[PDB]
Amino acid sequence: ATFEIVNRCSYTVWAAASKGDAALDAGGRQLNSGESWTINVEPGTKGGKIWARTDCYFDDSGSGICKTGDCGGLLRCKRFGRPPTTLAEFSLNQYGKDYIDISNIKGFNVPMDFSPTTRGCRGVRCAADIVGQCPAKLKAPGGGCNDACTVFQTSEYCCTTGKCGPTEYSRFFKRLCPDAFSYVLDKPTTVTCPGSSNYRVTFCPTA
Numbered sequence: 001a002t003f004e005i006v007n008r009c010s011y012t013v014w015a016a017a018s019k020g021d022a023a024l025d026a027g028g029r030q031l032n033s034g035e036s037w038t039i040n041v042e043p044g045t046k047g048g049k050i051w052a053r054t055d056c057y058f059d060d061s062g063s064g065i066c067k068t069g070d071c072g073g074l075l076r077c078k079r080f081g082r083p084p085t086t087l088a089e090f091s092l093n094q095y096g097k098d099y100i101d102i103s104n105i106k107g108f109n110v111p112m113d114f115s116p117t118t119r120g121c122r123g124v125r126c127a128a129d130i131v132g133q134c135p136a137k138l139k140a141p142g143g144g145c146n147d148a149c150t151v152f153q154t155s156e157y158c159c160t161t162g163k164c165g166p167t168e169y170s171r172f173f174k175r176l177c178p179d180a181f182s183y184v185l186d187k188p189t190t191v192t193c194p195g196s197s198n199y200r201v202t203f204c205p206t207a
Contacts, residue, residue: 001092002198004038004117005050007031009204013052013110016069016077017041024048027076030056031203043093043196050088051081052110052203054143067142068109083107084144086126086180088114088201098193102126103181104173108134109144113205121193126177127206135172147173148183159184 005015012032017024017039025039041048051069058064062075069081084107090100101124102114108130115123134145148157148169156164164185166174174182179189 001041001043001045001098001196002038002117003041003050004036004198004200005031006036006200006202007033007052007204008202008207009033009052009110011054013054013203014056014066014069014075015050015201015203016053016071016081017048017050018071018077018080019045019048020080021078023076023078024050027078028053028071028074030075041092046091046094048090048092049080050090050201051085052112053081053085054109068140068144083150084109084140084146086110086112088112090114090199093195096195098195098197099190100124100193100199101181101188101190102177102179104130104177105147105149105181105184107138107140107145107147107150108173108177110203111205113200113202115200115202116193117198117200119194119197121191121197124179124189124191125205126180127204128176130173130176133172133176135169138169138172157183 053066053069056066071077111127170183
């Protein structure tokens with residue numbers, strides 16, 4: 001499947017794509033403002049994620065650092081990035097269907113629209129100014145709005161027991177973005193699409 005990743009932000013981002021133990025396609029690339037990068041993701045990919053990284057510096061071998069979503073200092077991500085990261089999440093060809101969502105469980109850095117380019121389902125979006133409105137105690141000095149699990153490392157915020165409820169912090173993410181996961185056990189906002197759909201991830205979609 002094809003994922004067109006489009007940076008509509010006014011600033012450069014470094015897109016990343018991984019399923020956690022491996023890159024998807026090249027795994028990462030610079031996207032200047034307005035650039036589109038089209039990747040191929042293998043059918044059957046389970047637990048795949050795409051995200052933006054901000055304020056990155058890489059050497060001529062692809063090694064360096066980002067202020068948000070750094071994946072072990074690599075241009076080409078092989079693993080998930082360091083929070084805060086708004087997450088486009090997807091599992092493909094899972095018994096005949098694809099499942100997509102956006103998640104704020106690992107915080108928020110960049111606004112995002114995650115939509116099929118082919119027929120038969122809707123897109124998901126979290127494009128409110130979460131950074132600007134972020135609760136003081138969640139603000140990341142590196143940039144972005146952290147999730148409460150990352151900041152406080154409790155069983156309640158991290159849902160470590162599989163028993164956890166919504167929180168003051170999760171409610172903030174949910175108020176700003178109803179259509180994304182605000183905590184691990186949030187009422188699912190996952191969208192069922194046809195198996196083998198194609199997609200576009202658009203960073204800063206509101207323009």
